[PDB]
């Protein structure tokens with residue numbers, strides 16, 4: 001209102017104190033074309049903005065298994081004061097690290113830790129993007145049979161599954177959803193054989209929600225499509241990032257095309273960047289639970305190769321989810 005007692009601080013003497021941020025990666029690795037890669041692309045974009053480089057202000061620690069989580073979190077505490085655990089599985093390990101290092105800030109992606117001041121929790125309404133993926137799938141199936149390849153049976157993949165089923169049903173409950181789980185997010189070979197089985201049983205679209213396990217689903221659909229007309233190709237739906245690039249193939253009849261129908265987006269990269277900036281400004285949302293949904297565009301659908309009828313069905317379903325008229329289960 002007034003500030004009579006004041007002093008001028010010359011810009012020459014001012015600085016903003018920076019932070020150093022690292023991600024501890026799950027099984028999938030930073031080359032999973034999906035979840036962990038999204039996080040890493042986000043941390044790199046934050047580094048560029050802050051004039052940093054790899055191992056000079058930001059880095060990743062790749063986890064080899066569940067036992068490596070604690071080791072990687074301890075290593076990260078050496079040089080980094082903002083540490084992301086990327087995946088629900090890191091829940092217990094982040095809890096323990098946050099209690100050893102009360103001076104450092106921790107972020108858990110895809111699960112919730114309560115009552116720890118130095119831990120923020122980030123969740124996505126993956127059911128809402130799953131729903132749109134379901135609507136998209138229903139409006140393009142010829143065989144009225146679609147596949148769902150999950151990674152690890154969990155709260156997180158259950159949201160995608162429930163959402164996807166609800167979304168197919170909202171268009172045509174006739175349509176059969178074959179559900180199979182690979183038991184891993186880093187097992188391409190199991191994805192290949194589950195996809196092979198789902199396509200063989202008459203699925204013409206597979207939603208792969210299995211991280212790097214999903215590379216196998218792409219490899220399978222590529223083989224089937226590489227030995228057929230473009231007319232009769234089978235589709236996969238991408239997850240976490242726009243996966244259009246992974247769907248590039250040549251038909252048997254000479255034609256270059258793409259078998260990625262659509263991708264669910266999960267803006268993990270954006271979350272890493274936005275929270276890294278909050279942390280650096282000394283406004284880290286400790287103890288809070290940040291929920292990203294369709295409303296704030298934290299999840300969305302990329303309508304890559306979808307038909308115009310498909311795009312309209314998705315926009316109408318999105319509208320109804322944003323209204324509150326349609327409630328998506330978990």
Ligand SMILES: Cc1cn([C@H]2C[C@H](O)[C@@H](CO)O2)c(=O)[nH]c1=O
Pocket residue numbers: 026027028029032034035036086087088089110151156185209210211212239240266
């Ligand atoms: C690749 C990967 C995915 N996921 C989860 C979150 C993703 O949104 C979903 C599908 O990529 O699987 C993990 O929990 N850990 C991983 O290592």
Ligand code: NI
Pocket residue numbers: 005006007
């Ligand atoms: Ni004074």
